[PDB]
Amino acid sequence: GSSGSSGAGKKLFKCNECKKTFTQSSSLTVHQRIHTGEKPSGPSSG
Ligand SMILES: [Zn+2]
């Protein structure tokens, strides 16, 4: 079921932690650190 209302297009990079996107990679990268640098809550094993 494709109900693309908000986005779901022109995507190149997506975070498999908070389903976030960034027009560019660099932007996403700096955002990844957060998920890959936060208190040990659970075994990410990404
Ligand atoms: Zn994220």
UniProtKB/Swiss-Prot annotation:
Zinc finger (C2H2-type): 13-35
Compartmental location: Nucleus
Biological role: May be involved in transcriptional regulation. May have a role in embryonic development.
Similarity field: Belongs to the krueppel C2H2-type zinc-finger protein family.
Name of this chain's protein: Zinc finger protein 28 homolog
Portion of the parent chain present: 415 to 447 of 868
